[PDB]
């Protein structure tokens, strides 16, 4: 006899435990190992890849391939807003179904920079400059380019290399932020304005498009796992 007194914690089954176990058929010889291409060892391998953001939404711009394209047109007055959405992945209805956001809905915390690659898919003679600005929370989103400038912006000059990466840096008062909505922490506003209107010659279409891509940086980490809200079931699949 070796005296023991069972501490409370025994005779329970957690849904996140980890222990030794008794085997079923003992001495079973597991099949060999193949080095099948494209091994994954971390979720940040998957999260650092671009995925097209369906920025546009209306009510039927959310059931077609119209969702992913951001309409850009030549408008004579410059200072018109191209798009605008808050940065609050895994809650925002712009990043709720993207690749980054869908990995993010399994986590409660997130930290790190996020890259928004904007790709001009216009004509090959169309030009234009855009002032892509990210204004941290401190006020309720710019409504003019003259206010958007003050934030952290990047003027994108188009003409070869049809993409320009506006990297949103980490500005937060904490070392993590919630994926779910909260008001102790917020993520500010991402807006785009025309810097210099789309100049399109003759015989070239005057309505172009931009694509928005969301990816994670290498200074990115997620912590505290929970389970998604965007999947459901009623009765078991028969």
């Amino acid at each position: 006899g070796l005296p023991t007194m069972n501490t409370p914690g025994s005779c329970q089954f957690l849904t996140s435990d980890d222990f030794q176990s008794p085997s079923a058929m003992p001495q079973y010889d597991v099949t060999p190992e193949m080095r099948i291409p494209g091994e994954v060892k971390n979720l940040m391998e998957i999260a650092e890849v671009d995925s097209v953001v369906p920025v546009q939404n209306v009510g039927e711009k959310v059931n077609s391939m119209e969702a992913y394209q951001i309409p850009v047109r030549s408008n004579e007055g410059s200072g018109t807003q191209v798009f605008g959405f808050p940065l609050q992945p895994g809650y925002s209805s712009v990043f709720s179904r993207t690749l980054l956001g869908e990995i993010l809905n399994y986590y409660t915390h997130w930290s790190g920079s996020i890259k928004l690659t904007f790709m001009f898919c216009g004509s090959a003679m169309a030009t234009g400059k855009f002032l892509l600005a990210y204004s941290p929370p401190g006020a309720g989103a710019p409504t003019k380019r003259v206010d958007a400038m003050l934030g952290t912006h990047v003027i994108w000059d188009v003409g070869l290399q049809s993409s320009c990466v506006l990297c949103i840096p980490w500005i937060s008062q904490t070392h993590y932020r919630f994926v779910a909505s909260d008001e102790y922490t917020a993520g500010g506003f991402i807006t785009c304005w025309y810097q210099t209107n789309i100049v399109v010659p003759a015989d070239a279409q005057s309505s172009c498009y931009i694509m928005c891509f969301v990816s994670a940086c290498n200074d990115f980490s997620v912590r505290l796992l929970k389970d998604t809200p965007f999947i459901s079931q009623q009765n078991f699949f028969q």
């Binding site: 058929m25 003992p26 001495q27 079973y28 010889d29 060999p32």
Partner: protein, 269 residues
């Protein structure tokens, strides 16, 4: 760890590792390389989960009996033999001689019996499983002096705990248990046929220690055997025709295979 294939190539010399009489009672070893050409293939397959022991060391239910806690048969009795269950028996009868230790686990489960008795409440029945070595005393009434377990082993198990377990070593007059005995016990060659004293580990009796509830309760002792430290000699054909008796190899003739259509059909009926 199994063998590996190696590169060969064409063959035009007088070797013919294929052609060889199998009339000599010699089962020839022919590799892929002999009938074709196969490059060097490494095999990491393991021939472990096929060892003699691992094969036989699986707990199989050999039997189960029932005994009322208040009535007539208040005890059950069983002459130990693996010959009561088809499943375990066929595995053992794949070898002529086997030697092993036993692990006896008993899974006792109680069931209330329908009655008109008032206020039936159990106070945790305790069961006694007792091993009586061959040529021991034999209990009759459940209150007999025999149940004092003076030297006879017994497990006392209170219901609602991990099932009782005990080991038995290799107990045989000989040096192996015979799974097939051709011979009589009598010198005049009559009487019992192959009821030799080498696989007769006495009897095992079980009963209710307490008087349980006021009403009747019937308990079901289920016996499990698990061969540890197995050594098996002389392989032999597995049984074909169904078993008929628990001490004889009696059988009714039946098919040699499951039938199909023609000799050249490619689909089983």
């Amino acid at each position: 760890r199994v063998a590996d294939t190696v590169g060969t190539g064409p063959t035009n010399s007088e070797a013919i590792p294929a052609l060889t009489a199998a009339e000599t009672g010699h089962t020839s070893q022919v590799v892929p390389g002999d009938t074709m050409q196969t490059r060097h293939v490494k095999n990491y397959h393991s021939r472990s989960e096929s060892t003699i022991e691992n094969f036989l060391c699986r707990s199989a239910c050999v039997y189960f009996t029932e005994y009322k806690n208040s009535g007539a048969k208040r005890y059950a009795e069983w002459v130990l033999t693996p010959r009561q269950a088809a499943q375990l028996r066929r595995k053992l009868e794949f070898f002529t001689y086997v030697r092993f230790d036993l692990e006896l686990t008993f899974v006792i489960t109680s069931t209330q019996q329908p009655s008109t008795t008032q206020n039936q409440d159990a106070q945790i029945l305790t069961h006694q499983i007792m091993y009586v070595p061959p040529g021991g005393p034999v209990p009759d009434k459940v209150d007999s002096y025999v149940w004092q377990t003076s030297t006879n082993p017994s497990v006392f198990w209170t219901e609602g705990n991990a099932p009782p377990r005990m080991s038995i070593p290799f107990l045989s007059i000989g040096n192996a248990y015979s799974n097939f005995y051709d011979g009589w016990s009598e010198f005049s060659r009559n009487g019992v046929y192959g009821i030799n004293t080498l696989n007769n580990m006495g009897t095992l009796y079980a009963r209710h220690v307490n008087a349980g509830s006021t009403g009747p309760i019937k308990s079901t002792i289920r016996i499990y055997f698990k061969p540890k430290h197995v050594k098996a000699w002389i392989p032999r054909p597995p049984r074909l025709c169904q078993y008929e008796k628990a001490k004889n190899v009696n059988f009714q003739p039946s098919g040699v295979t499951t039938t199909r259509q023609s000799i050249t059909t490619m689909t089983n009926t």
